[PDB]
Design a protein around this nucleic acid. Structure first.
Ligand SMILES: Nc1ncnc2c1ncn2[C@@H]1O[C@H](CSCC[C@H](N)C(=O)O)[C@@H](O)[C@H]1O
Ligand SMILES: Nc1ncnc2c1ncn2[C@@H]1O[C@H](CSCC[C@H](N)C(=O)O)[C@@H](O)[C@H]1O
Lengths: 259, 249
DNA sequence: ACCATGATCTGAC
DNA sequence: TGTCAGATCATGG
């Protein structure tokens, strides 16, 4: 299922499986929305939250722009797969003005359609010899067709108010796998997240957590044990199969921990 | 439309457009059949010819081969997308025995399925970290379902005996482009091809020449001029600066 | 490509 | 026999 934008570690492929395990609810809370592949494909009302505010402001702005408004900007900066000079100009403009729409047009031309913003709030992703494709507005239309049920916010996960009747889906960065957004993570942040879930559990709040217990040779010991306190499902078909025809130093172990 | 095997310069994309120009005929002569994307997909009877004997013999052998036979050889050698040493072993066996079935199985494991025969007849394509796949099956099934109307030939084009009522389709190596089989072409070879087509005309025989008049700056001009004599269609669509043409009488 | 994913193919660079 | 974005086709949320 499509997400609003390309995004490292998205759940487009896993969404269908994850939904099957989702409970019934009065309000859905996507604590770490990211590219929204989760928020866009569940029943509302939805609360999509993410720490990276510049990205949330882009979503808030997308709600009121047409594809034409987007093509108008691409035509204005004369952007193409070979327009490095113009890509740099557009990047400079966004870094100064912080026009949310200019950021959306930027990602379409950056390296791997990735959005890398430093602490100063500026876009550092290099040109990617890319541009919109005959399927770029497919995501855009998916977003427009499902944004009406969503309420965005850009707060640190700790500051989000969870209420009775809500279901909390958590998909934080993963220490064991590389990802630009790892910069916002540390062991400390994870402990607070883990502490936070237990609370919702003791408050009659159902939640769901995505993560990886193992990868390439490392492991998240602390989480491995913590998870034994709930219901666990191993989503990576390859890791599951090789447990029986294994050698040892193999791949990733994707899971969905839900109370 | 698929050919019998992947092949650089195949006409799988152009065949539909080309056929709308082909006449009726008593016999279709595919002078430079290559991967057979044309031969397997036109009404027969057909005469499929190519100068590369190894490939033609592979086709001749293929007629008497079942997919399970292909799989038996793959098990026997234990090939896979990571079996580089077993690939080298199969290649060595083919090079010594020259058995066509081994070539067929071997080409599925080489880079882009390319069949590169060197100066002494040995297969030298590098391992391609790949093996058979659904396309392999599809092409094989397509060959078996359409090989009945074809008679194969492995001769230099000037040696093939063309008859009355024949339609001679020719898709030779293009001077302007790059292909491994260009080592068989040259200005002189092309000169004689154009002379033969003229003879076919003098005899009242229909032919169709696929080719390139312009590609990457370079241009073929005796062909441009020689073209003025007959009908020409430009198929350059969607690929850039190239000017794919079809010259027929 | 079609609903969407993903394996594979192919034409620029 | 490199890289890879976009296209093609098989099939499974
Ligand atoms: N303290 C924090 N609070 C909320 N979100 C945080 C955070 N630290 C990092 N993140 C967010 O963690 C997200 C992990 S990616 C989650 C991906 C998402 N489910 C999808 O399908 O695309 C990033 O978007 C990052 O901005
Ligand atoms: N002198 C010659 N006589 C016959 N065939 C020749 C030749 N010199 C080169 N060739 C053959 O020219 C072919 C050009 S490729 C033609 C491709 C074919 N229509 C397809 O759809 O696959 C090659 O297969 C090459 O072996």
């Amino acid at each position: 299922m499509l997400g609003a934008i390309a995004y490292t570690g998205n759940k487009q492929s896993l969404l269908p499986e994850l939904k099957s395990h989702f409970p019934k609810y009065n309000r859905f809370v996507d604590l770490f929305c990211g590219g929204l592949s989760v928020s866009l494909n569940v029943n509302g009302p939805v609360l999509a939250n993410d720490i990276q505010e510049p990205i949330i402001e882009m979503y808030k702005r997308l709600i009121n722009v047409s594809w034409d408004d987007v093509l108008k900007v691409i035509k204005q900066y004369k952007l193409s797969k070979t327009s490095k000079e113009e890509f740099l100009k557009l990047r400079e403009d966004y870094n100064k003005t912080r026009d949310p729409l200019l950021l959306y047009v930027l990602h379409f031309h950056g390296f791997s359609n990735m959005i890398r913003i430093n602490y100063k709030g500026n876009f550092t992703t290099p040109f990617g010899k890319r541009t919109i494709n005959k399927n770029s507005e497919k995501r855009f239309n998916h977003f427009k067709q499902n944004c009406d049920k969503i309420i965005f916010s850009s707060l640190h996960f700790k500051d989000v108010k969870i209420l009775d009747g809500d279901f909390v889906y958590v998909d934080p960065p993963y220490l064991i796998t590389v990802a630009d957004y790892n910069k916002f993570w540390s062991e400390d942040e994870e402990k607070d997240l883990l502490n936070l879930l237990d609370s919702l559990n003791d408050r009659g709040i159902k939640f769901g957590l995505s993560n990886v217990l193992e990868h390439h040779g490392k492991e998240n010991t602390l989480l491995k044990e913590w998870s034994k306190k709930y219901n666990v499902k191993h989503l990576n078909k390859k890791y599951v199969f090789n447990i029986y025809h294994s050698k040892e130093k193999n791949g990733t172990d994707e899971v969905y921990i839900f109370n």
